[PDB]
Amino acid sequence: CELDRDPEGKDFQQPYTSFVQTKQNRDGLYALLRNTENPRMHFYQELQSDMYCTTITDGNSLAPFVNWDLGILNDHGRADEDEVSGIAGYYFVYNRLNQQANAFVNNTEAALQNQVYKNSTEIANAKSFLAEGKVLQALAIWRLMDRFSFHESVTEVNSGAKDLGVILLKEYNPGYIGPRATKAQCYDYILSRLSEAIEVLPENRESVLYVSRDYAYALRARIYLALGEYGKAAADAKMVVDKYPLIGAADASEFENIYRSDANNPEIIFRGFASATLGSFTATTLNGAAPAGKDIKYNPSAVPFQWVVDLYENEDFRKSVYIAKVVKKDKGYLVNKFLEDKAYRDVQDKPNLKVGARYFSVAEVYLILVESALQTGDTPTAEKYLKALSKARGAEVSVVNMEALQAERTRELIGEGSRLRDMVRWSIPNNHDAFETQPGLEGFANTTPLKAQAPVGFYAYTWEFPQRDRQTNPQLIKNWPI
Amino acid sequence: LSTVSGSVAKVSSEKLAEKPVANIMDALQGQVAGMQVMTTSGDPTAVASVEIHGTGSLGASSAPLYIVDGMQTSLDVVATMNPNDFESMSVLKDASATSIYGARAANGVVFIQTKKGKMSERGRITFNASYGISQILNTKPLDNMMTGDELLDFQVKAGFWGNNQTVQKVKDMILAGAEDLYGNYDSLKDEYGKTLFPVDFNHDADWLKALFKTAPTSQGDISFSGGSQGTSYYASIGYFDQEGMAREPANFKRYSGRLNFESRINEWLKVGANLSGAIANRRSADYFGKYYMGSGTFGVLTMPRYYNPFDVNGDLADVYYMYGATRPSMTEPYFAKMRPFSSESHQANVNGFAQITPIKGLTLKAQAGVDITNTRTSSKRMPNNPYDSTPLGERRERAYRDVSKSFTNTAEYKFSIDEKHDLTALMGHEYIEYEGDVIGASSKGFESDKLMLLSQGKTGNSLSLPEHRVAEYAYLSFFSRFNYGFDKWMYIDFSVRNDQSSRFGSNNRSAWFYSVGGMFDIYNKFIQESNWLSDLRLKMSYGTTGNSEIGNYNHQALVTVNNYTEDAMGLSISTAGNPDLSWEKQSQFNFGLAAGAFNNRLSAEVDFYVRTTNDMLIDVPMPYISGFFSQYQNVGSMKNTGVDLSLKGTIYQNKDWNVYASANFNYNRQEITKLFFGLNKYMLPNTGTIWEIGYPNSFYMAEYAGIDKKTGKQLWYVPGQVKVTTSQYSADLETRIDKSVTPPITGGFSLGASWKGLSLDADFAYIVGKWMINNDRYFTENGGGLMQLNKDKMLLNAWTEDNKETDVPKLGQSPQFDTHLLENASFLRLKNLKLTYVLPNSLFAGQNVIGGARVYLMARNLLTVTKYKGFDPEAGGNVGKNQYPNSKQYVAGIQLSF
Amino acid sequence: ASTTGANSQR
């Protein structure tokens, strides 16, 4: 009686014997990344910024983030075989990305040292798959650092944590239960992973669906910027900023058709693969969309304060695409950046509001070069690239002077999880209790006070660690006092 | 069947027959001492949670092994059988008594014996039929929810509808919004204001009636029993249909047949079969236990009463309105017509046996059977309905297959070496196999009711991957069992066995288990006769047992496909792994005593027990840095100490007047002893419970203190400080609370009086020490969030400067999950009341066709004494959400005998 | 339309 049973649709873990086994595992890494560096995952930190008020429709999904309900944000999220959502989710997806990028990076390095490949053409490509795995680790550890390590500006913290990064693990080890690495460890792992990869990746990008040198340049520049290293961010900026041109639109409809097309947006540096049948997801949290026949109706759960609407000139193509006056049919604006890519519609005629995961677009690089150039005294190229970005958007900017940077960035990066970080570094308090709500939306978008204030350096600009990781690892030091 | 020394409770025909629910374990709540059954959903299709002598484990199931006539079958397959075909249930609750079962006999075993034909001369046919209705059993939850304009008022004054708005300004807006929404659908545009008032501030919509109904239960049954010689037959056909009282559709109907047969062929051989099958249709309310706006008991409490799901004739509309909605919202019946669902199960249960007797004393018994389930399920999303996102329809067909075979053959030698030494030897073999399989395909894009074949869907971006899942397991085991009996007063039982499970790797799938036991007949040896003591026996047992109820594939370290594009395959790591995962090794010391009083008209049986789970199968949670969720490991330990006693006796005054009572009790203290990763405690995140080494599975929250009369703020006690309060809640204010999650007291009682054909039976059940978090009240009682939903009438009283003398806080602050939600879910329940009348004997002589008839009136679940503020106190473990309460049943029934 | 508010899970 042989009573081994082995599960169908599963294979045993083994080391990489062939090049075809390696390539297949690199895809699973990129699949993983697609539900991780995913716009759904960055909405939580998008909604926690100073830009949104909750509507009467919300069912306490976005309220903990908009109104700073610290009693809910503490344990926020889930991460089981039913739902991966919230803070706990953001945490869990980036760790799996890192762990699984661990076993890929380490198993390619093993195969190379065991000379298993059949010629130098495989060897050369697998040494290049190796650099990609490295960038994914740096992204995974950086995204974990963006949200669970403190800025230098924070005041009160649990004792010990102001200098801690996240738990750094450079090995594929599921049983690992260690302590938090230091800040300079985590950032030196991120930057050196990226440096070791920028050496190997070829000057010209081979696929917009995979890691390239152009991407790692940009992701690195994003990271330097949030590190205050203004001069160093501007150098990675300049290496890619000129290879991706801005959307050529005459009105806002030519703009929306191009921007919303994953396939035809010349600004997309690195995106996740999407079809209607694989890799497309709905991201209808910000916009509240639902199909109605051939149409789209909206019931949002949160909407911008008036000052966000008033950021956009009326001739700004983003003012009908990034935000859209389609709340209460035509009375107020919502954030509509992630509305749909029509290419993912099951039937041309009918919307299903599916989009793909974008990972870096040259618009962000324009804004990183512009901000950094202002700080390092380079006005000529600080104003060149900001006027360039706003004129392409139909509302070229009056004066270029950092005050101007903050608006244009806020406009362009809206919806992308970027504003909350910008206010920490720009030393802006929340000031949500005093913003005017959109008047056209009276009775649907009302003011709701903060359940807890968030002044400069408030500890809750940084998320606490998930209570799973705290309860199973007494050697984990918490972020929040007491 | 079971040992002279094992703890054994046996339940009779009557506790099992004629029950308006297909979950027969509910019919045992409060009947077996130490057996704690609890059904947490009134959904017809739900199955109870039996646990003998505590929770056996923190990761493997603690459900008893179920056996019907020799073959392990799931509660699901037992549900498709006719329980009028059940002769008796025997509960085996110690290692001595459960020694010849495997898989998981560490949880006790429930053995169900179907009736065989009585070796009668005429042979009895017997006919049963009953009708009755289901209701909800508690209404008290909506006695104190705000009324319509009570809630309007609360909101307006709370600023939820904006600042400086009057009540009428607001109702002007809500009626405005229903008029323009309804005005866009041809099916509504000139019915709003004539026949539809979705918004109505002058009548409160009865949201209980919207989502719950009275529903029927119907069952009937004929059964021919008899046989005569060496052969016996028991055959029955039957019908059952229980419709679910939630208006969200749910039902369990079965069409049943069974034939039991035994025949002596000659002085050496006896063969026999029991054959059972059924066509069964089940459907379940799948939105319960989640928080969805207008459904379930959460719906019936939280829907603002100025929202009307009804029309103008009091009937339920197709669709209701909620402000902001972009679509009218389908009501529960109209959702059902638009989301149809059906499923047919063909259930087969074949079991034979052979009993060769070659020479005096030995009995070779070979037994085998299959347990095939082919289930076929259909689901649609009906096209052209204007309250959907698209006019295009979808259809999903699935097919399921479960085949589980098991052979289990024995050789048994009984002999005697004197007049005072009885010996019995028996050893046996058993192979258990299970092969399961699930296949499903679906299409979309349909544009016609009549053109909805799967093969007719759109093809392109509308195509899907099929659904496909397979699962198999297997068990190989060799067992032995001996019986020594000296002078018929001293009896010893010994057993050794080895079990091997497919669920563990090759190097760890075997395990050895043993048991010793002795029964000592104190009455018949040390006291030949007493004028009041009738029977006195002392039993005692020690033994070890296996527990294997976990996944089928939980040790391998595996890869699955995770494709990135469409032209190449992709591969990710799937499971963490435990090459050493193996059996959970449980241990039982049981000291029992049974006593018989007067003239065997008064019995007692007390048992003290010590249940130990070592090598415990924990599905250990893993830190998220690991990139996994779980991985089973043999990690940790646990203890279950307790007592269970049961006693019964008879009270005649007239002999032609029987009065008989019965009582049933267990207490059980639980102790986790060893955890994982050196941990002393592990709180289970966002569950409000905690595993801590010293104590049992307990709740873990902050002690809510009340409010600061000065500020209106909520206060919690700060643990350890002196008593110290705070307005600043933090997760580090939580502490272990001396309340257990598995309820420690299980019990029941049942009375009976019989006059002369007329008799009354009532069965009670209780579960004290139960505690539950009322997740529902997290919504109904707060004034800081979810301001759409109806609230409890206590928030009209909330602290403000001028109304500063309350214990309900100021509005604007959300509640934390603290003790204010820990409710005492203890309950006594009247499990069934039955008045029955068997027609007199002299009413039949003269008509030689009918021999008797019986009529009965009957109620299930009418009395529920409890302090719990949420419908059913049984409907939950640690939390109680949008519950489907257990039902209350009234049934009248008939029986015929020919 | 679901109200997560808080789902203390079972």
Q: DSSP letter string over B801-853? A: TTB---SSPPTT-PPPSSGGGEE---EEEEEEEEEEEEPPGGGTTT-TT--EE
Instruction: Judge whether B278 and B256 are in contact, CB under 8 Å.
Output: yes
Letter for the amino acid at B651?
I
| Chain A CB within 8 Å of residue B563 CB | yes
B822 φ/ψ angles, rounded to the nearest 5 degrees = -80, 100
Kindly list the distances between the CA atom of residue A81 and the CA atoms of A78, A84, A167, in Å, as whole numbers in the listed order: 10, 8, 23
Kindly list the distances between the CA atom of residue B7 and the CA atoms of A405, B37, B54, in Å, as whole numbers in the listed order: 80, 18, 15
Measured CA to CA, the distance from residue A351 to residue A340 in angstroms comes to 8
Letter for the amino acid at B658?
N
Cβ burial A434-462 (10 Å sphere, 16+ → b, else e) = ebebbebbbbbbbbbebbbebebbbbbbb
- For the residues of B36-74, what is the DSSP string, one character each? -------STT------BSS---SSS--PPEEEETTEE--
State the distance between the two ends of chain C, measured CA to CA, in whole angstroms: 21
Letter for the amino acid at A477?
I
B168 φ/ψ angles, rounded to the nearest 5 degrees = -70, -40
Return the H-helix or E-strand segment holding B614.
strand B602-614
In total, how many domains does chain A have? 1
Contacts of C2 in chain A (CB under 8 A): 59
B109-114 and B65-68 strand pairing? parallel
Measured CA to CA, the distance from residue A187 to residue B12 in angstroms comes to 71
> What dihedral angle (degrees, nearest 10) is formed by the CA atoms of A33, A39, A42, A47?
-170
Record the tokens describing residue B792, joined without a space.
């409890």
Contacts of C6 in chain B (CB under 8 A): 775, 778, 817
B179 φ/ψ angles, rounded to the nearest 5 degrees = -75, -40
Burial class (CB in 10 A: 0-12, 13-18, 19+), B656: exposed
Record the tokens describing residue A1, joined without a space.
């009686």
Instruction: Judge whether B874 and B281 are in contact, CB under 8 Å.
Output: no
Most B CBs within 10 Å: which of A19, A147, A159, A472, as the mutation test of the B interface? A472
A467 φ/ψ angles, rounded to the nearest 5 degrees = -75, -20
Which of B573, B574, B536 lies closest to B553 in space, CA to CA?
Answer: B574
Vertex B96: Cα angle to B94 and B99 (nearest 5): 100
Alpha helices in B219-369 (DSSP H): 296-302, 332-338
Record the tokens describing residue B400, joined without a space.
């399921």
Return the H-helix or E-strand segment holding A371.
helix A362-375
Which among C1, C3, C10 has the least Cβ separation from residue B786?
Answer: C3
Contacts of C3 in chain B (CB under 8 A): 291-293, 302, 779, 786, 789
Domain boundaries, chain B: 1-117, 118-898
Give A13 to chain B, closest Cα distance, Å: 5
Within 8 A by CB and 6+ apart from A434, the residues are: none
| Chain C CB within 8 Å of residue A60 CB | yes
Subunit contact B624:A347, Cβ cutoff 8 A: no
Task: Show the beta-strand stretches assigned E in A55-198.
Answer: 78-79, 84-85
Give A77 to chain C, closest Cα distance, Å: 10
Record the tokens describing residue A353, joined without a space.
């509001």
Which one-letter DSSP state was computed for residue A474?
T
Contacts of A463 in chain B (CB under 8 A): none
The three-class DSSP label of residue B619 is strand
The residue range of the domain holding A224 is 1-482
Letter for the amino acid at B620?
V
Give me the residues paired with residue B31 across strands. none
Where do we find the tokens 């501007």? A234
Instruction: Judge whether B741 and B878 are in contact, CB under 8 Å.
Output: yes
Measured CA to CA, the distance from residue A448 to residue A165 in angstroms comes to 34
For the beta carbon of residue B730, count every other beta carbon within 10 angstroms.
17
The three-class DSSP label of residue A398 is coil
Where do we find the tokens 């739900």? B46
Subunit contact B778:C2, Cβ cutoff 8 A: no
Give me the residues paired with residue B90 across strands. B10, B111
Instruction: Judge whether A96 and B625 are in contact, CB under 8 Å.
Output: no
Within 8 A by CB and 6+ apart from B164, the residues are: none
| Chain A CB within 8 Å of residue C8 CB | no
Where do we find the tokens 């991966």? A84
Measured CA to CA, the distance from residue B258 to residue B237 in angstroms comes to 7
Instruction: Judge whether B617 and B550 are in contact, CB under 8 Å.
Output: yes
- Biggest CA–CA distance in chain A, Å, is 82
Contacts of B569 in chain A (CB under 8 A): 24, 27
Expt. technique: X-ray
Instruction: Judge whether B48 and B37 are in contact, CB under 8 Å.
Output: yes
State the distance between the two ends of chain A, measured CA to CA, in whole angstroms: 60
Give me the residues paired with residue B828 across strands. B766, B865
Subunit contact A60:C2, Cβ cutoff 8 A: no
Vertex B577: Cα angle to B575 and B579 (nearest 5): 150
Return the H-helix or E-strand segment holding B264.
strand B251-264
